[PDB]
Write a protein that binds this DNA or RNA. Sequence first.
RNA 1: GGCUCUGUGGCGCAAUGGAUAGCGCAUUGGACUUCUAGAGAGCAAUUCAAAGGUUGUGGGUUCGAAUCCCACCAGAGUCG
Lengths: 257, 223, 289, 120
Amino acid sequence: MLVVEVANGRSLVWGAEAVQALRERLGVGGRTVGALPRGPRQNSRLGLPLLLMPEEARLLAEIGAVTLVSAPRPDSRHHSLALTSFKRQQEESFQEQSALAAEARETRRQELLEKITEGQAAKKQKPRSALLVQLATARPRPVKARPLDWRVQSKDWPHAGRPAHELRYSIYRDLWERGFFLSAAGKFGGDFLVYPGDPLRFHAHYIAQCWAPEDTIPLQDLVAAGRLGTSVRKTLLLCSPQPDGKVVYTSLQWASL
Amino acid sequence: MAEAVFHAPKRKRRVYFKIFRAEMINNNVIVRNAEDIEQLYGKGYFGKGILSRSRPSFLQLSLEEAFFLVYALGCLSIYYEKEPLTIVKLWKAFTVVQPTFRTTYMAYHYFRSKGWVPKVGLKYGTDLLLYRKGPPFYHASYSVIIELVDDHFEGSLRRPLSWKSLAALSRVSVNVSKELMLCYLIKPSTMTDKEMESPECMKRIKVQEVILSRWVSSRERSD
Amino acid sequence: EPAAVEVPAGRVLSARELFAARSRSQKLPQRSHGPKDFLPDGSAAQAERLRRCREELWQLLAEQRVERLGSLVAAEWRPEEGFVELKSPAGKFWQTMGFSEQGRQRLHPEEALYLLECGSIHLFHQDLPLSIQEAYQLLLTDHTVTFLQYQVFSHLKRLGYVVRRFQPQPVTPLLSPGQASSPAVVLQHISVLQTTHLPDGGARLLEKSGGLEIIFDVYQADAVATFRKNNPGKPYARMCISGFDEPVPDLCSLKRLSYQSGDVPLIFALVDHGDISFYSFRDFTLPQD
Amino acid sequence: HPKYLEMMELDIGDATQVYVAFLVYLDLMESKSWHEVNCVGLPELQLICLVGTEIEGEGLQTVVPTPITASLSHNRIREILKASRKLQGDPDLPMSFTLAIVESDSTIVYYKLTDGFMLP
RNA sequence: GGCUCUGUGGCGCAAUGGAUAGCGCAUUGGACUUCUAGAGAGCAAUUCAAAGGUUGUGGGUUCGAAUCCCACCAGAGUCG
Ligand SMILES: [Mg+2]
């Protein structure tokens, strides 16, 4: 069982093991929005915080693997103990890092020995700033966060009860029951991208478009989405729930006539 | 006012008075005479081949093109099996056939009054295209969307635009090397919905082009 | 009340892990090494490639920002005033970020969060170093700065930009045979439709506010070497920030923001569950071809 | 024209859809050189359809002419899928049809809609 | 006039005593994808590789200095 701290309708995951479990077991990968430690000034590969979609959080909570908790707030009953523990930890890190740096310097000097000697012969004959601290991407302390109720609209979960979220959640659940991987497709003109497998190695084929049944479809939008899918080698796949507890799709393609 | 640039209109690697007459059949406009078709598609590139892709070398003018020809130029006179129609009746008939014809025709008139030859952007998912000097010579550079609003900027959205739709259209027009332009049409809010019956309301109408272009944050990093 | 969920403690690094982090190569492992497949046929080669890519991704995301406490300019988080106060003197980033008032070096919330992400500072709150999770929770609210706004700020700063917070029959055809002489003459006669621009008549809408407002001023990366805080000049583009779910800005919003911006290009900074989609509306006069 | 009145002899829908069907028939026959196209109708939805053969000896292919100025709710899409399946002779193949949208300039674009998933 | 900070490939930056001084954007080449009225475009139809240097100049410490220390050159902020 995992935890996904929710705040203002934003599901974020701050653990690497949580994302490892989500992508492998539950077939959900989400997106990364942080900054990479090993290079912060590039936008090619981003950091840890996993921006799970509202549907990706509701569904994972509705299957018994994710417990949506609300983001805690500062508690004044632990600050003194936290300060004492933090000071002890920083002193321990100071000592250990100093020792390790000294040993590393000694080892490298021994390795370069006799070369230092050759240099010195050819010549004569002729720590505070070093301390390292971690800017942790997740809380280093455990917190007691009240769980979240997602069936009743609230301030930390404004999604429940809205049509645009319920329809998308139904379509996401039905497309995820079939073992597909799913991801947002704002760039591609649709609400989802359907990958036959992990999106790392495999492309996607279907650019979903979560349309309500009675909602009118502007034919120009349909044509644009179909042509975009063609130009990306993907088939537009309309989706919509039905009152009889079933969802019907319609693979829209371009006939090369 | 950071007026958008005018990226050069690319060329095609390859290349290559008289009162007209059109017949309104089945709520659509048609042109039959041969020389009339030749002049209509050669001297302006109006309409599309009845069965061919572009030219009738084996002509059906869209609503906007036919109305432009009759009104802005006065060369074309649409008919209904016995009846030379008048510009007001054309406005009403084409609004009945398509409720959102006023907006599209006003945008078409604005763009074609600037020398650009526009065409339907059905294939790319838009309302109008813009071929410079004609379709054969230059690749169309602009894919046009059209809306309507009043001087207070409140009106009936002709085509609702979610960010999904704008992203899709921009990506398509980028992949086909085109610019996605919105052509918001602004009308006085104090104009009653009775002057719209006459076409002269355009003189009080105000256009506002907005080139919606993607901004790749990495390419615009320096100059 | 419902039971209390105990979120587990995050990852804590040791001396060996910290030193290994400081000896890291900044070579990014390639995303999905090799071209992308199109049909999962169950081939063991596909499974091996997937295993390789996944293990690389998990070894990458398990890395913690490690920095030396000689370049980690300390800072303090002041929620009452609503900024961050620097204890030690600032560094290179002070040529483009932060402001000085009352005689102290003070940082804005989003700027402080970005510096925390880049390892430039060591943010504190009540004498406790704030992690990036707690910094996201506190510094990003509906009062100080949103989450989408910080997302865009951090993106543009990572690319190397300078983003500074905003601080203000009876009816006849139009043409007759007697006026067809030159293409320009006709194209002007039948041009009764008068064009406008986003700011034209833009003064009377700032009262009709609500919804979308400009946020940042963007200076390109090249303008970072010689940047004057007091006299920075005309920015490259003023930034509005929205979401992919939120409605497209109406023409009212476009005119209002364009007037409130001036001769600076407008940019919108859409966010779609993490993706960033900097679309930019820009007035345009179609040349009389 | 024989087929023009054939579409217009069923008294279904409006004139615009009849003309759209005539255009789509003309295209699919005299441009793609399909083996044979036969007119159809659908009073259940005030709709018109065309059934033709892509290649001699192959199966049939439904067509659903549409003007761009007409809305299409996904429920209508399912209805037309079922109608086309009934027109296809009720085979085991997944339901499908053609959506040859038509503008007032006779421009035609074909986007076949198939029930379920269809890879590119 | 004093004080603080900055200077590394075209740009943003890492490395802050020892290997080949490296990462991204950018540029140039590979492979593939689409192009219907699009040589282009390519953003989970994307995916790879190369080349790119006055480390501000000068001097010093040291067996090696982009790493430390001084002199200055240019730049930014603050005070007065
Ligand atoms: Mg530089």
